[PDB]
Amino acid sequence: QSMRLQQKINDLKPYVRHARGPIKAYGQAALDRASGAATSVSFAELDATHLDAMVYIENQRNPGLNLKHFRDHYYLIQALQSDGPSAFRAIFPQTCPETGQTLKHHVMADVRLHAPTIIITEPAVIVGARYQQLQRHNLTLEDLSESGVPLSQVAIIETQAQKTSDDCVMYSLNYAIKAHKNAAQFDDIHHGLQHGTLSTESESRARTTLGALEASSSYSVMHEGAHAAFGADVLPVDFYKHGASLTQAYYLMKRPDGRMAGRVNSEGHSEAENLVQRNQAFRVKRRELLDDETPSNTQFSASIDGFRLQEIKRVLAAAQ
Ligand SMILES: CC(C)(COP(=O)(O)OP(=O)(O)OC[C@H]1O[C@@H](n2cnc3c(N)ncnc32)[C@H](O)[C@@H]1OP(=O)(O)O)[C@@H](O)C(=O)NCCC(=O)NCCS
Ligand SMILES: O=P(O)(O)O[C@H]1[C@@H](OP(=O)(O)O)[C@@H](OP(=O)(O)O)[C@@H](OP(=O)(O)O)[C@@H](OP(=O)(O)O)[C@H]1OP(=O)(O)O
After folding, report:
1. Which parts of the chain are beta strand (E)?
2. Binding-site residue ranges
3. How many helices (H) and strands (E) does the chain have?
4. Which ligand is nearest to the CA of 303?
């Protein structure tokens, strides 16, 4: 139990207790989730359902965010083929190549239009348990490619900040907001991608699961052309504020460039905070078995859940 997440709970509880409809049920499930109680439902589906009502209030909160929710990844392609905004971000679930069904596992795409440039951010890992995320990313990339977009101008960035299999959509959302807040660096990455290159990819692609597989297999496992890199080398510290792993926070603050060793809360704070401190401020035990107790601290940062509570408070306050 942690005072910060508890504070977030106390902030949200009235809004849910005053809510009506499916959003009350969702908010209650989120409160249970955060509090450390059991959740008799999958949160990928819940988040997927109530993503739009958020996206709206977040687009209000930060004009210029340009966040969109696409039911398919083909709707992303349809959206690309328009003289729309010069820069927009989209959240979408992957599609199973052998069934054509959407399978949760959402990702976010920071997009610039011009020969368009696409940046897919992976909250978890590129490869996956049974090489599933890999071939799914492959489907997405192939479709983007026959859409007309050159694969040398698309980049998937594995962050490995998310350690759970449930919080895809919230990580995607926070990553959208942060991609808007950190527009400059993304503009840099896009200027790079326009000429078909990615900064320090040579070192940074190895640090991903995709890198280990490409080095252990020595044959193309992900599509020829598509770029990839580890988040800590190309993204700002904002993308790791919700990393569950404290070891990750430690290893990130220990980086020589010291990009991840700064302060991670707004400067308008009496008490400063860095990555590790924030991780420790949202540090709670986790929810699996007693027979299968795990090595390393069984604990993690439930900061992302607090992000969920945050979004729900914003929506429920926005509606009333
Ligand atoms: C990343 C992964 C492959 C294992 O890498 P790993 O993190 O080296 O495995 P570890 O056993 O060392 O996990 C250690 C970290 O996981 C964190 N963790 C917290 N909740 C977790 C969870 N539900 N599942 C896995 N790891 C979790 C632990 O806190 C620890 O961080 P700490 O040492 O700071 O506490 C694995 O955790 C994972 O994400 N698997 C899912 C990937 C996948 O197939 N699909 C994802 C798409 S949803
Ligand atoms: O995710 P965002 O939409 O970008 O919201 C962020 C942020 O959230 P993150 O933890 O996900 O990075 C902080 O909230 P905390 O969880 O750290 O407490 C912050 O607040 P502080 O920096 O002062 O701590 C503030 O939230 P709020 O809107 O409630 O003020 C802020 O969004 P803003 O751009 O509105 O400041």
Report:
1. 67-69, 87-95, 102-112, 117-122, 154-158, 227-230, 283-284, 300-301
2. 4, 8, 61, 105, 129, 163-164, 174, 178-181, 241-242, 244-247, 266-269, 278, 283-286, 296-300, 310, 314
3. 14, 8
4. 2
Distance from residue 55's CA to the centre of ligand 2 (Å): 16
CA 12 to chain centre: 22
Contact 16, 311 (CB under 8 A): no
Which residues form the catalytic set?
A: 105, 122, 168
| Among the listed residues 239, 306, 316, the one whose alpha carbon sits nearest the alpha carbon of residue 57 | 316
- DSSP H or E run through 298: none
> Structural domain boundaries of the chain?
3-319
Pocket test for ligand 1, best of 160, 166, 300, 301 (most atoms within 8 A of CB): 300
Resolution in A: 3.4
User: Which residues have CB under 8 Å from 196's CB, separation 6+?
Assistant: 150, 152, 153
Residue 177 near residue 242, CB atoms below 8 Å: no
Residue 45 tokens read as 């589906």
Task: Tell me which H or E stretch contains 215.
Answer: helix 209-217
